[PDB]
């Protein structure tokens, strides 16, 4: 057998070859099975000698290859046969397919998709023909003898994939079958039949089995269709991701689920290395555009794969600008969203991209390090971007998020992620010391977020102690910062904390004041958190007790600083004032101070007070003022130095009660009553005198304070208090703002005791005051304007002035005492200050709301709707027995609290109707000539109504009446509710307009169409009422104008919207119906409002212009659709 097919190889072809084979016929079966067997490579020249025997220029030949053909094929798969026997024999089979006829060509690719209804193969080895059999199939253009032949060679090619993709491949070989198609050229038909054929399996696989996958498609894409490919990979995790988040608020996927999206993204960013269109694909595709996509657009994993792309240069600035123009529109689009009701209704709430991006960081934990780099530098270009600035130099909501979302990144990156722990903080300190005038606070506020997450990890930290070294460099305001934040380091690392007093002590010798201004706020800062131990009898450290591993701090410790601080006393006023104040700060802190610093206090007054009993001006004021030069400064602001006595003594005497201490507040006890009692008796010259004055205004206000506090009891010091307000007013009217020299605990105690407090003993304490009644809304504009001192800065005055849980207290007292005064002209003060609290309490201590109005007495709109009531009711009150003039002002902030209030009740509610209806029946039962009260009133109006134009059309209806034609009255609707009513309808043709633009960006969408169009129809109405009317010529004129020309543009783009959409049509009766109602209605009645304006005057091209390229689009779509239209808009 072999032997004698051997000499015919060595011969010649027919004759010897073919003959031989008509002989056997039988079984080529039995004999190759068992002669690989035997030797391999004995069956591995077998076939070149048959297969040469076999030509397709005779029939028996080629007929008999098919044969052959299959049984390799059959143990190739079947057997157990080893590789090299395996690939040698698909080697040949391979190499020797290229003249096959276009006929059996078909039957052997056949036989293949006939394998893959069912099969074990275990070898796609077979699958390997495939390729060269359809490849060679194309090459034929010309009928086959087959069936009908009616077939090319590309034809059949193209009906055997067909059918590759409507039969089901197996689990098995269906990765085999994609690399398959790898070599095997395609039709765009071909691929996204192939492409969409594997997607449809993905659904089917455990999910561990997708990444080979999605390799393995990857790789045809780049012969094939790059947005299809991206699209599907991402719309499937995208999906994936949806359930898994819906199963987490209902680890166990986490690991495999995300470990996989990483290794795809890797894989994905893989090719878009190798080929950039593909990238540039990704990022074509995801790019935002109209905002109904950048929702759909963004997701946590695309965003993620993102990241994990700026790892390549090129594609860094842009997909840092896709994500940062993202976040704003994801958050101003929501910001939208929640200002209307009719956007409600038509567009459901969206995930927002700020929250996605946040769940990437999440979704990071599990071995994403590729998308970390991308991850931390893209939250600081928001924090860099979206930072505050020219507040320092003299809707920022989105800047405001932006910059946040850019904090919250970055913060949540260092918790999560150990390795980049440390370049997060260089980065930020970096910018901190580095950074300009150009205001680093929201920096500052990240860092203190960071060491306060893990003190631990910065404890050593030598890039914070090194940032101390400019600590003389940089603006005061960021050493405190930077102190303040850096503290529970102190507390840790003893390096640091030495290296500061190092640094600190040698601050304190700048000549530059802000230098030395900044180490007090250093040691200070130490001293609070620093105590000794010493040779004595929230927790501060002992600097003490190691003394092998401090070299500077010792014993002396704590007096060492306040020696070295008591020189500032001999400072510029600036400085000691600043003293005064840490002072406090630090005897709060720290109790073994208190003897030290009282001492130094107490020997700072000796200086100007006169012991000699009775030389009536008890202090010397005249020490206060120095003159050098020309100029005249004051140094030392006595008046704080006695407040700070005044509230150290009141400390002292409150908190320690547990010996040359007693004898100092003893004989500052003293000091302080003979100046109480001895104190109730430009140019350069005058330059000195002021200061004086409001120096004593100060004094005698810190007098105030101290006798109150002394005893809260007896008339006769009432009578004091009452004498020093005496004296206080008295140089107050000789004669102003945050001055106050009352603490804000004082302003709120006196406040309540004055109006709430009569049940003690003595109504005198009141009456003392009550009637002078200068110095009755005197304290009562104190506490008014500090509250508004509140909103200008954080601050106030003096002690825990910035404590923010200390200010919640006094504004919860200071609030329902001004509401039992206006329960019951002082009267209308608390009005105005009860005002400014609500203000500040909503958009400062918002979290803390629901605590606010507890004090005062679902359930937070509860209280909202039952302090509403209580003063609609007292507007009401106002209104109803109005006597002729009597308040434009009281009528105006009286509303402004219910504006505020109002904000608190939930847009659903039942409560809030209560206050969109009252207030609806106000404005039609009600009118007035004051044009301040009614803007507001219908700004309240509206402000409640959008989130619930009829308003709008039957406004228009009443100044339309009340004016021109050439409840609101002449004075009233002419010159302002005409401009409010122009302003509030172009917000709603805004909306509109993004409306319009949004259902053209897609390429229920009905619903909308509809809604659009009652929405302009409405507004037309609207419109014709004014554009008939007489209206001012001043300005009123002008913005209709404006308001016109702009409905024009907005059903210009409802036109070419339509002419987009019946390209692929009908133009149904809504549209129809109301696009004449213009032409009737709008146009012609505009044209007759603009010779009203030349001639009664003796911009106006905007109008006819808008007007002109409004008909110029409907001659366009009449003609280019369906109906004459334009031609009855004439008619």
Not at 92 to 102: D, N
Not at 472 to 487: E, R, Y
Not at 621 to 643: K, N, R, W
Not at 785 to 792: G, N, Y
Request: with cysteine.
């Amino acid at each position: 057998m072999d032997l004698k097919i051997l000499s015919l190889a060595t011969d010649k072809t027919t004759d010897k070859l073919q003959e031989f084979l008509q002989t056997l016929k039988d079984d080529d079966l039995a004999s190759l099975l068992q002669n690989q067997a035997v030797k391999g490579r004995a069956v591995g020249t077998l076939l070149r000698a048959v297969l040469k025997g076999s030509p397709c220029s005779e029939e028996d030949g080629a007929l008999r290859r098919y044969k052959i053909y299959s049984c390799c094929i059959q143990l190739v798969e079947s057997g157990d046969l080893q590789q090299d026997v395996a690939s040698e024999i698909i080697g040949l089979l391979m190499l020797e397919v290229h003249h096959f006829p276009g006929p059996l060509l078909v039957d052997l690719a056949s036989d293949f998709v006939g394998a893959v209804r069912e099969d074990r193969l275990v070898n796609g080895k077979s699958l390997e023909l495939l390729p060269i059999i359809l490849t060679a199939l194309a090459t034929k253009k010309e009928v086959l003898a087959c069936g009908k032949g009616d077939l090319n060679g590309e034809e059949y090619k193209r009906q055997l994939i067909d059918t590759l993709c409507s039969v089901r491949w197996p689990q098995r070989y269906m990765i085999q079958l994609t690399s398959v198609f790898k070599d095997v050229c395609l039709t765009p038909e071909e691929m996204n039949l192939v492409v969409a054929k594997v997607l449809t399996m993905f659904s089917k696989l455990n999910l561990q089995e997708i990444p080979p996958l999605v390799y393995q498609l990857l790789v045809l894409s780049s012969k094939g269709s790059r947005r299809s490919v991206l699209d599907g990979i991402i719309a499937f995790f995208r999906e994936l991701d949806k359930q898994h988040r819906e199963e987490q608020s209902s680890t166990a996927p986490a690991d495999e689920l995300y470990h996989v999206e990483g290794t795809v993204i890797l894989h994905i960013v893989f090719a878009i290395k190798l080929d950039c269109e593909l990238g540039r694909e990704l990022l074509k595709h995801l790019k935002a555009g109209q905002q109904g996509d950048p929702s759909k657009c963004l997701c946590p994993f695309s965003i993620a794969l993102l990241l994990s792309l700026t790892r390549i240069q090129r594609f860094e600035e842009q997909v840092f600008d896709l994500l940062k123009t993202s976040v704003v529109k994801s958050f101003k689009d929501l910001q939208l969203l929640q200002g209307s009701k009719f956007l409600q209704t038509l567009v459901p709430q969206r995930t927002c991209v700020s929250t996605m991006i946040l769940e990437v960081v999440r979704n990071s934990v599990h071995s994403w390090d590729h998308v970390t780099q991308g991850l931390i530098e893209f939250g600081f270009i928001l924090m860099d971007s979206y930072g505050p600035k020219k507040i320092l130099d003299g809707s920022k909501m989105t800047n405001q998020h932006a910059c946040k979302l850019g904090a919250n990144i970055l913060l949540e990156t260092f918790k999560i992620h150990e390795m980049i722990r440390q370049e997060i903080l260089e980065q930020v300190l970096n910018r901190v010391v580095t950074r300009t005038s150009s205001p680093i606070n929201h920096f500052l506020d990240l860092f203190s977020d960071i060491i306060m997450y893990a003190p631990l990890i910065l404890q050593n930290c030598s890039k914070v102690t090194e940032t101390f070294d400019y600590l003389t460099f940089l603006p005061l305001q960021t050493v405190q910062g930077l102190l303040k934040a850096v503290q529970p380091l102190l507390k840790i690392s003893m390096s640091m904390r030495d290296s500061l007093i190092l640094v600190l002590r040698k601050a304190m010798f700048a000549s530059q004041l802000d230098a030395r201004k900044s180490a007090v706020a250093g040691f200070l800062l130490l001293l609070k958190n620093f105590k000794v131990l010493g040779s004595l009898p929230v927790t501060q450290v002992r600097v003490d007790v190691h003394s092998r591993y401090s070299a500077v701090a010792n014993e002396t410790f704590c007096l060492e600083i306040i020696d070295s601080l008591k020189r500032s006393l001999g400072q510029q006023a600036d400085i000691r004032l600043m003293l005064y104040d840490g002072f406090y700060d630090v005897l709060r802190r720290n109790s073994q101070l208190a003897s030290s610093i009282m001492q130094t206090l107490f020997s700072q007054l000796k200086q100007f007070y006169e012991p000699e009993p009775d030389l009536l001006p008890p202090l010397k004021l005249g020490a206060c003022v120095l003159t050098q030069g020309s100029q005249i400064f004051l140094q030392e602001p006595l008046d704080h130095l006695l407040s700070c006595i005044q509230h150290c003594l009141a400390w002292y005497k409150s908190r320690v009660v547990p010996e040359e201490e007693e004898e100092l507040y003893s004989e500052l006890d003293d000091m302080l009553e003979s100046i109480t009692v001895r104190m109730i008796k430009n140019t350069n010259v005058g330059i000195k005198n002021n200061i004086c004055a409001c120096l004593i205004m100060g004094v005698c206000e810190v007098l105030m304070e101290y006798n109150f506090s002394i005893s809260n009891f007896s008339k006769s010091k009432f009578e004091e208090i009452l004498s020093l307000f005496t004296c206080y007013k008295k140089f107050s009217d000789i004669l102003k703002v945050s001055d106050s020299l009352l603490s804000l605990k004082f302003v709120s105690d006196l406040l309540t005791a004055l109006f709430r407090d009569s049940i003690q003993s003595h109504e005198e304490s009141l009456s003392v005051l009550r009637s002078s009644g200068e110095f009755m809304h005197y304290a009562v504009n104190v506490t008014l304007q500090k509250i508004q001192q509140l909103i200008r800065t954080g601050h106030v005055s003096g002690p825990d002035g910035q404590n923010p849980d200390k200010i919640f207290q006094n504004l919860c007292d200071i609030t329902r005492v001004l509401l039992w005064r206006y329960t019951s002209s002082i009267s209308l003060l608390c009005l105005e200050g009860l005002q400014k609290t609500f203000s500040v309490v909503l958009q400062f201590y918002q979290p803390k709301v629901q605590q606010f109005l507890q004090a005062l007495d679902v359930t937070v709109t509860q209280r909202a709707s039952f302090q509403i009531r209580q003063f609609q009711r007292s507007l009401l009150n106002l209104l109803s027995s109005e006597e002729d003039d009597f308040n434009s002002k009281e009528a105006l902030l009286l509303i402004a609290v219910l504006s505020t209030l109002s904000r608190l009740l939930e847009p659903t509610s039942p409560q809030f109707v209560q206050m969109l209806s009252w207030t609806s029946k106000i404005c039609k039962e009600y009118s007035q000539e004051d044009a301040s009260f009614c803007k507001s009133l219908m700004n309240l109006f509206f402000s409640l109504h959008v989130l619930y134009v009829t308003l709008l059309r039957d406004l228009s209806q009443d100044i339309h009446g009340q004016l021109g034609d050439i409840v609101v009255n002449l004075r009233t609707a002419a010159p302002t509710v005409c401009l409010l009513v122009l302003s509030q309808a172009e917000k709603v043709l805004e909306e509109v307009d993004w409306l319009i633009a949004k259902i053209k960006g897609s390429a229920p969408t009905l619903l909308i169409e509809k809604a659009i169009v009652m929405q302009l129809g409405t507004l037309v109405t609207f419109f014709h009422e004014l554009v008939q009317t007489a209206l001012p010529s001043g300005s009123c004129v002008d913005t209709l104008l404006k308001g016109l020309s702009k409905i024009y543009s907005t059903l210009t783009a409802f036109v070419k919207y339509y002419l987009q959409v019946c390209q692929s049509s009908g133009i149904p009766n809504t549209v129809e119906k109301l696009v004449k109602l213009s032409g009737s209605h709008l146009t012609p009645v505009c044209y007759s409002f603009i010779s009203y304006v030349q001639n009664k005057s003796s911009p106006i091209p905007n109008l006819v212009f808008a007007i002109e390229q409004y008909e110029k689009f409907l001659i366009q779509l009449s003609k280019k659709s369906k109906v004459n239209l334009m031609q009855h808009m004439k008619l």
